[PDB]
Design a binder for these strands. Sequence first.
RNA 1: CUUUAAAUCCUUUAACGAGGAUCCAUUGGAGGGCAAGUCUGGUGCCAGCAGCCGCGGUAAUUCCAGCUCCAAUAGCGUAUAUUAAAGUUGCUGCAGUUAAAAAGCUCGUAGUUGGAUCU
Lengths: 33, 141, 218, 180, 83
Amino acid sequence: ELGTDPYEDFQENWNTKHSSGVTRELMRELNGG
Amino acid sequence: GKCRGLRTARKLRSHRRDQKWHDKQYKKAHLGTALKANPFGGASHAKGIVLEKVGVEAKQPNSAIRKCVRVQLIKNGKKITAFVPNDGCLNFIEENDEVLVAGFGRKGHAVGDIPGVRFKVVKVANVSLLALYKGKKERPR
Amino acid sequence: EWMPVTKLGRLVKDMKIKSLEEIYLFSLPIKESEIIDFFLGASLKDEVLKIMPVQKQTRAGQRTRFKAFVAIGDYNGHVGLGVKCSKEVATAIRGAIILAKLSIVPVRRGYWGNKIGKPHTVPCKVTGRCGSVLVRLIPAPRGTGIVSAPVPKKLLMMAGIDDCYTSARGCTATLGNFAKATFDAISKTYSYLTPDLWKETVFTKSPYQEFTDHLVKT
Amino acid sequence: PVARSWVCRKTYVTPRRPFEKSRLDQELKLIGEYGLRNKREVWRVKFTLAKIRKAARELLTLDEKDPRRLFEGNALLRRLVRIGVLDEGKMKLDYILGLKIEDFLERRLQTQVFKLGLAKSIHHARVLIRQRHIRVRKQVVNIPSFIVRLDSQKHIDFSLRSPYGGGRPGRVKRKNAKKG
Amino acid sequence: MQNDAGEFVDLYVPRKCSASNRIIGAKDHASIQMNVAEVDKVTGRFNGQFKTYAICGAIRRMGESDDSILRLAKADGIVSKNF
RNA sequence: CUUUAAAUCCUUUAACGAGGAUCCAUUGGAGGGCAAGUCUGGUGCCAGCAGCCGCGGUAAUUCCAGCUCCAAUAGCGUAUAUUAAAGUUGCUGCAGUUAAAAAGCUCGUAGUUGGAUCU
Ligand SMILES: [Mg+2]
Ligand SMILES: [Mg+2]
Ligand SMILES: [Mg+2]
Ligand SMILES: [Mg+2]
Ligand SMILES: [Mg+2]
Ligand SMILES: [Mg+2]
Ligand SMILES: [Mg+2]
Ligand SMILES: [Mg+2]
Ligand SMILES: [Mg+2]
Ligand SMILES: [Mg+2]
Ligand SMILES: [Mg+2]
Ligand SMILES: [Mg+2]
Ligand SMILES: [Mg+2]
Ligand SMILES: [Mg+2]
Ligand SMILES: [Mg+2]
Ligand SMILES: [Mg+2]
Ligand SMILES: [Mg+2]
Ligand SMILES: [Mg+2]
Ligand SMILES: [Mg+2]
């Protein structure tokens, strides 16, 4: 099952309260670390 | 520009010595007015007697009532507003008690929403607030 | 399938150019991304350095775009950097990867003391500038490692430098300028005239001039 | 005034950045591969290697004919060859900079007991050493961080008093035999 | 360039400008590698041999490539001495 | 037994001494800086947290708890003085048009500095 999309989360919450989280998630999706 | 002569050591040293006084922290540490005005007198901690309990309104945009205590130090007799940091710890302090007070963490500068408060309570009635909060020790009574 | 649109691409596809150093020797601009894939191939690894949202004020409200910084390298003497701004994150990342592998430069490596074995550090002190950011690279003894901030360290590792001392001045919180300054400093290694390069240059046939008859056919 | 000595020093240095992912991964890999108790044991060997590298780099700035360089680099190389990290053919002063922490980690008694087949695991080797089952050519050693010299490599065995090296059976065997 | 053993250790050897001796980098797109044909002294036709000059972009931006090429050709005997 | 003035401790040795081997490892955190959960239950700009940015006004990734997860480890938090970070005291090595800044202008003692030339 495909539950969470980091790209959508960042693009939607980049200016919200949960920005610092989603950015931190997006890097994990990109750099593999 | 600066002088680069071979015999200009006195000029350079004198200029640096005189221009060090325009540094805020060097002047604060070497002038003596701050040490005289410091209620602790340079100590890390102090002991005082709780004069009363007060509530300080948190600065905007935050809205809350920070519980504090007015105390009077034993060595010099100065009056100080100290913060009691925890959920419900103000019920561990009674009036006319003896408390240990330390700094707030910013070297005499106010921290957070609390205006003009730079001290916090550590131990009350010779027992630590952490032990009372975690229920490890009881009030002596 | 790859169909080149330039003479250099046709020469590379038809196996007329042996190595990328032939292209670097004649300072021929690279306009096709497939050449680097043909030469460097699997040794290339990339890493996203930053995703930065920028906004343009309009009548109805702000319009947001995302800028991706991607550094790439093969850890064996070549390094590149790319920046791409788009509406979507994935498109910007793909564009940044393409732009980074397009602008790939070689790195010259030297010795600190006795010249034994393979080179491990920069030939000399090199400085790069970008905005207010100044970055200085200094040779280091073998086994020292890279003494720098996290951002320049990744580019130095991807370039293939093992040991180096680093100095930096200016507002380095600007990640783009911080990366571009050290990229420029790394690029300046082959542009420094050292006494061991004082020999007179022997010229050679340019790939355009050498393979003109084959280019006429295709 | 007293007749005591106050000379002492620390054997490790803490890293500047407390939370660095790459450093944590590398240190945990080292701990897992060599069965170390904590991060401090890695930092101790790192400090030792740093001191050796600093001395070697300081001796490399002198002239080749300087008497102090010739006297002290020779001693440093001799000690490195003695402990086994260096080789006889690589006794130049530049090769010291080519040393890594794994070379020093390979010379501990804990890893040498495991590599010689006395133990079936590195953790088992540490347990055997700490429980007084291993002797070094005459002496029972129970310090895992013991650094084995080259000439002592052939002389690691079970202690004569150990149940494994021909000694009396242990507590559990005696109790179980008493049971039946 | 090379180690103590004498083995050459470099990716490539960059070429230098013929006018100013400066190194022509890999990203210098204003540099020129020009060839000048050689003629037979008897007939005047194309010999098949040529002389190669390389000019960096810094000189070209200064507008000094014309004089440099002229002097290089005069030194090689392509241009008449009584130019 | 040895140790010592006589002892103690360490070392050496008889006998007893581990399955929940209950012979139980703690101190701080889990938004970013900075390693690690927008999991569940409460509270509802209150209580509180927060070095800084900030969180909390009925779906709180930040408060009070449970579970789980991080870091160091017989050690770990807090307050204060001090060093590096600070090329934010700059001799190495900082700035002075507009971000803080060159005296309204000139003369001038001390100080600093001072053109070639001799085998
Ligand atoms: Mg002030
Ligand atoms: Mg608020
Ligand atoms: Mg800043
Ligand atoms: Mg805990
Ligand atoms: Mg919690
Ligand atoms: Mg944090
Ligand atoms: Mg993190
Ligand atoms: Mg604020
Ligand atoms: Mg709720
Ligand atoms: Mg909740
Ligand atoms: Mg300081
Ligand atoms: Mg410094
Ligand atoms: Mg300051
Ligand atoms: Mg300097
Ligand atoms: Mg400044
Ligand atoms: Mg002004
Ligand atoms: Mg004026
Ligand atoms: Mg005068
Ligand atoms: Mg003179």
